[PDB]
């Protein structure tokens, strides 16, 4: 089992070598367009880029570049789009991307302020009277309402493509106590947030891929996605013992670099998956237990 590997990893204290090992094995593909001079100001961090092969392209003739990747998990049959926290000049591209990609949901795993710095643009309206219009890609965004919990908030947004006046509802799931380069408070509150996004319908295959981000779109987002995929995999066979977490993280880093930033986020992934396996394996009652534990209200 993964649970045996965990104990055994923990016992000999070797998470950091395990994680280093992954870092060494991880793929490396060109990110030439990310690196073009015209895109300098479309990238939040010098060091974090989309590979060319998996990057999301805007449907615009001017400049199709956005710091975003399609993580496409073939065996699990789920995709996500991982992106960085939008910059003040690319909140229009971010919303363009969700319109074009037909996502129903965006998962935000960070605060716009962390560790004294602005980690993300305020890319969505904070109240009903004051919608956002993104004039460059001709999109309108309105808070329809939000459901505030002690550790996360869900919002309902309306996205209008101003060019045809089509309209879509986007669910925003905002985790606000997961620290940059840290980990969720516990497996239960992580699993409860994840199942909130599952229950919501946004992950379902009748929609475009969910867009998940943190500040870089790699640490916290890779953690979130790795757990979800692992649970999905376990689900379809009902066979926990044919999931290899490290191996799934490595299929993931074929599509974007740097997925999962430290060895404890790695270790939290095992925690999250081992716990969630309870629910996957037929004990649904754990779900409401995660909710009690997580103290959502
Ligand atoms: O929001 C999060 O949860 C998150 O992940 N945030 C990140 S990942 C990250 C940073 C931050 C940040 O918010 O400060 C600073 C830039 O570097 C990467 C770390 O460095 C690198 N990440 S990488 O694997 O893309 C890579 C390649 C080469 C050199 C450095 C790097």
From Swiss-Prot:
Q: Which GO terms describe its molecular function?
A: cadherin binding; enzyme binding; ephrin receptor binding; insulin receptor binding; non-membrane spanning protein tyrosine phosphatase activity; protein kinase binding; protein phosphatase 2A binding; protein tyrosine phosphatase activity
Protein name per Swiss-Prot or TrEMBL: Tyrosine-protein phosphatase non-receptor type 1
GO cellular component, as recorded:
cytoplasm; cytoplasmic side of endoplasmic reticulum membrane; cytosol; early endosome; endoplasmic reticulum; endosome lumen; glutamatergic synapse; mitochondrial crista
Outcome of altering residue 214 to S?
Catalytically inactive mutant; abolishes sulfhydration
Cysteine sulfinic acid (-SO2H) is found on 214
Describe its partners and assembly state. Answer: Interacts with EPHA3 (phosphorylated); dephosphorylates EPHA3 and may regulate its trafficking and function. Interacts with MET. Interacts with NCK1.
Membrane-topology descriptor: Peripheral membrane protein
Q: What is the stated purpose of this protein?
A: Tyrosine-protein phosphatase which acts as a regulator of endoplasmic reticulum unfolded protein response. Mediates dephosphorylation of EIF2AK3/PERK; inactivating the protein kinase activity of EIF2AK3/PERK. May play an important role in CKII- and p60c-src-induced signal transduction cascades. May regulate the EFNA5-EPHA3 signaling pathway which modulates cell reorganization and cell-cell repulsion. May also regulate the hepatocyte growth factor receptor signaling pathway through dephosphorylation of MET.
Outline the extent of the Tyrosine-protein phosphatase domain: 2-276
Q: Which GO terms describe its biological process?
A: actin cytoskeleton organization; cellular response to angiotensin; cellular response to fibroblast growth factor stimulus; cellular response to hypoxia; cellular response to nerve growth factor stimulus; cellular response to nitric oxide; cellular response to platelet-derived growth factor stimulus; cellular response to unfolded protein
Measured against the full-length protein, the chain present covers 2 to 298 of 435
**What post-translational changes are documented for it?**
Oxidized on Cys-214; the Cys-SOH formed in response to redox signaling reacts with the alpha-amido of the following residue to form a sulfenamide cross-link, triggering a conformational change that inhibits substrate binding and activity. The active site can be restored by reduction. Ser-49 is the major site of phosphorylation as compared to Ser-241 and Ser-242. Activated by phosphorylation at Ser-49.
Q: Which residues carry this modification: Cysteine sulfenic acid (-SOH)?
A: 214
S-nitrosocysteine PTM positions: 214
Instruction: Give the tissue specificity.
Output: Expressed in keratinocytes (at protein level).
């Amino acid at each position: 089992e993964m649970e045996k590997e965990f104990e055994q990893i923990d016992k000999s204290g070797s998470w950091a070598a395990i994680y280093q090992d992954i870092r060494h094995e991880a793929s490396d593909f060109p990110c030439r367009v990310a690196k073009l001079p015209k895109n300098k100001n479309r990238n939040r961090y010098r060091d974090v880029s989309p590979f060319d092969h998996s990057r999301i392209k805007l449907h615009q003739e001017d400049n199709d570049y956005i710091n975003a990747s399609l993580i496409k998990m073939e065996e699990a049959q789920r995709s996500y789009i991982l992106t960085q926290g939008p910059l003040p000049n690319t909140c229009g591209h971010f919303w363009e991307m969700v319109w074009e990609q037909k996502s129903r949901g965006v998962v935000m795993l960070n605060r716009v302020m962390e560790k004294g710095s602005l980690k993300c643009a305020q890319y969505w309206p904070q109240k009903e009277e004051k919608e956002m219009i993104f004039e460059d890609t001709n999109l309108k965004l309105t808070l329809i309402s939000e459901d505030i919990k002690t550790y996360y908030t869900v919002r309902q947004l309306e996205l209008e493509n101003l060019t045809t006046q089509e309209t879509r509802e986007i669910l925003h799931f905002h985790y606000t106590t997961w620290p940059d380069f840290g980990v969720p408070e516990s497996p239960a509150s992580f699993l409860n947030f994840l199942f909130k996004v599952r229950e919501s319908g946004s992950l379902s295959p009748e929609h475009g891929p969910v867009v998940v981000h943190c500040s870089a779109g790699i640490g916290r987002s890779g953690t979130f996605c790795l757990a979800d995929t692992c649970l999905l995999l376990m689900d379809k066979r009902k066979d926990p013992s044919s999931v290899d977490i490290k191996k799934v993280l490595l299929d993931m880093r074929k599509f974007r670099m740097g997925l999962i930033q430290t060895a404890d986020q790695l270790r939290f992934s095992y925690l999250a998956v081992i716990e969630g396996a309870k629910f996957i394996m037929g004990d649904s009652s754990v779900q409401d237990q995660w909710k009690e534990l997580s103290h959502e209200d």
